[PDB]
Assembly symmetry: D2
Homo-oligomer: 257 residues x 4
């Protein structure tokens, strides 16, 4: 009765490392991403080590592509058990009056609508399967951290996410669906690191950390496999009493920023 | 002293317009429906103070720009923003909530919050400071049981995040940004004519002594929330910024 | 016209709070560690129009608290308003190096103090048929965790908020509102404490080239500021507010 | 090598489950409790199932006993790597004005002073050893739930515990010590079973849950083995980047109460 997971934003970072992690537990993985070739490459690697995997190309904020990806995946394997809502962008960070409506919309569409679409379309199958496990990947931003220069839209979306998670934990417990949130700090790259960041000087409260600001690793970002490991635990039956909890994975950086 | 208050046709918005006008604050009552805000403006001019009624859908760039331009062109400046406009939208099980229903709750409560702040911050900067309050809820902040209320929960939780980013971003411009978080006001907690399948989503519970401890039973008054906003946009609160405040008579802890 | 007990009233937030509450036709019992100070505020309250009494007592001591609350009901007949506001910073040190008595002392004053202050005043407030309580906490333990070696303090400030919320629900039917106040730096810098050791061992080094109190370009908040909020929270202007924390930090806290 | 753990409250419930869960990954265990015999059978069970354990009798509010127990464990196995501060008592729940100062003192001494003592004594050994992992078992009370009838004193100490965990995550990051808080809901017994509960009708907001108040389990409280599992995850290397975090294990309940 081998378990099935949809993992979004699987083409890289945490999503990718998550996909490997779970494949290694013999979870068969639907790896959905915005770029065919990246998601093909991870599905390949998974099959290369004798796993099961479909690459699914889709834009997470698009209703039709998503329905088509979900239907596709259930058809190939028969059931759905595990969902990781990981797709997100940072989008534009800029002064509240410089951030344009259309660029606000875009961060809301991928990060926020994508979460709604992802769940709406998968919850039916989970309900039918008799239960499963959901994790949505949020952030320290909007939960513990409010300093990332002009990141309001992102922040808004990331706070929304943990709220969705707790609402649904309750809605879905009677259906034996566990819903958790995972909140990373900087993974792989600096917290501030966005090429669509504009006008840092206006938004940043200036600050120097002579000894880094990620205490457990001595200033260094956490790594994709770290988040992977956590999601792997939370989607397993080892976490069978855990629902509607966030879990911060920031090496202490949340408490700092 | 000039205030823009959105969702000002009724409820908290109407009550805040009145309370603030009573402190001598020129009010720009803004709302979905013209006659509602005309009436609130009229009562204010009628009772002594200065006002103007502004008809805009809060999710709409264009109306909002006009609405803001017009308020600034009639009174000179901006000092206070109460971002209050919003909707419950449809509450339904996550699988029954439609994409377009989801989009509409986000459009009004979230995008409308963005736009409201997006357009008023330059004026508050020019004036050299001011006070913002965004009206959230116990939903998304303490309370996660309101049935199928996901989209709404989302927006309310988002707002508090916005408030804290903006408190830090704007502190140096002397703009204070706070979040007010009422429990049930006027109407009770789960009264929404667009609720579907409440059966399937509420976790069944009974409250023999009620679940608003301080008013043992009934919801709070719009004028209550108005009082809080009044305090929070006043000089009495000069050092308060980036704080949420729960006005739920304890209901937030129960639910 | 109603009566309020203010602990820690000899100075700081306490004093400011006694003053502002007077300036509202509120009769104050100023309770402090050291009489010279509290009779000094009480004197200033009287003859400047208002009713007031000074009370000497240590919050962590059962008998004195029982004593002094008795003494304040006798003189004015009732209690309407308690403001629990007495604390020490106490010793801040590495958890490694902080000592049991030092730890113990910060629990006595801040935690046991607050339990006692409410233990012996709730009953009169119920009898009055309702009133208002506010407990003065801190960004420490609520939003802030970098104050070097302040664990003990942080423990008690965090417990205060928990207490507020528990009793807010327990005392709702008695029409007693219960709220928290959580100041950032007031009058003084946030790591300013003469009983702090091994700062460099404990503190994560950080430089704030432009301050870390946004609304003030980096100057600590003022006692009157906090007082004003307390004054709001005890008035009937806030009839519906109970079981809530309110942060008064000028944004620091989102920052520390 | 083989790491050494100190688990306090290892007599029964979560502590005993934890000791066994830890021992199963080959961790050496100092099982510590108030009553010698309870921790004798958890030690003796691990030993002769292959493990290494020793029983440590101590009152967690007493400096000298705690110091000696901690010291014994280091003398026996040479180092300390893991610490699960779990000892705690419900104490007396009563109206605020009914609750006697001495019985207030009792709850603080055991719950709070016992946490300080547990950490103060163990931390030097973790430093010395060059790293390690700590978890304090707090509760949904004081963090999410505030309705447990007149449980003020208890609630107060649990909320302090999670605040300490965060200070200490920051203070000990550079020393490579992770410190997280686990907050279970009801486990083994209902949320409200306390023989020293007193005037519960005067303190409860009356409430009825026709379908129960713990979603993921159709109203039943979680198992000790559940909490142990979380603790096991959090003290291992699968959690290298997690520190400073609460985690709720309440099957939804904390969101209800």
């Amino acid at each position: 009765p081998s378990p099935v997971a949809l993992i979004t934003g699987a083409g890289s970072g945490i999503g990718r490392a998550t996909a490997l992690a779970l494949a290694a537990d013999g979870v068969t993985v639907g790896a959905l991403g915005r770029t065919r070739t990246e998601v093909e490459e991870v599905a390949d690697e998974i099959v290369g080590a004798g796993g099961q995997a479909i690459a699914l190309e889709a834009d997470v904020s698009d209703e039709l592509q998503m329905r088509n990806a979900v239907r596709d995946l259930v058809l190939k394997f028969g059931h759905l058990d595990i969902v990781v809502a990981n797709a997100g962008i940072n989008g534009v960070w800029a002064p509240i009056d410089d951030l344009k409506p259309f660029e606000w919309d875009e961060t809301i569409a991928v990060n926020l609508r994508g979460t709604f679409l992802t769940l709406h379309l998968t919850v039916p199958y989970l309900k039918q399967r008799g239960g499963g496990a959901i994790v949505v990947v949020s952030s320290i931003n909007g939960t513990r951290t409010f300093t990332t220069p002009g990141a309001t839209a992102y922040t808004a979306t990331k706070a929304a996410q943990v709220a969705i998670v707790q609402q649904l934990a309750l809605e879905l417990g009677k259906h034996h669906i566990r819903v958790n949130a995972v909140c990373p700090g900087a993974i792989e790259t600096n917290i501030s690191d966005n090429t669509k960041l504009r006008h840092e000087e206006e938004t940043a409260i200036p600050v120097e950390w002579p000894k880094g600001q990620v205490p457990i690793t001595d200033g260094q970002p956490g790594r994709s496999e770290d988040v992977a490991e956590l999601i792997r635990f939370l989607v397993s039956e080892r976490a069978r009493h855990v629902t509607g909890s966030p879990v911060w994975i920031d090496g202490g950086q949340g408490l700092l920023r």
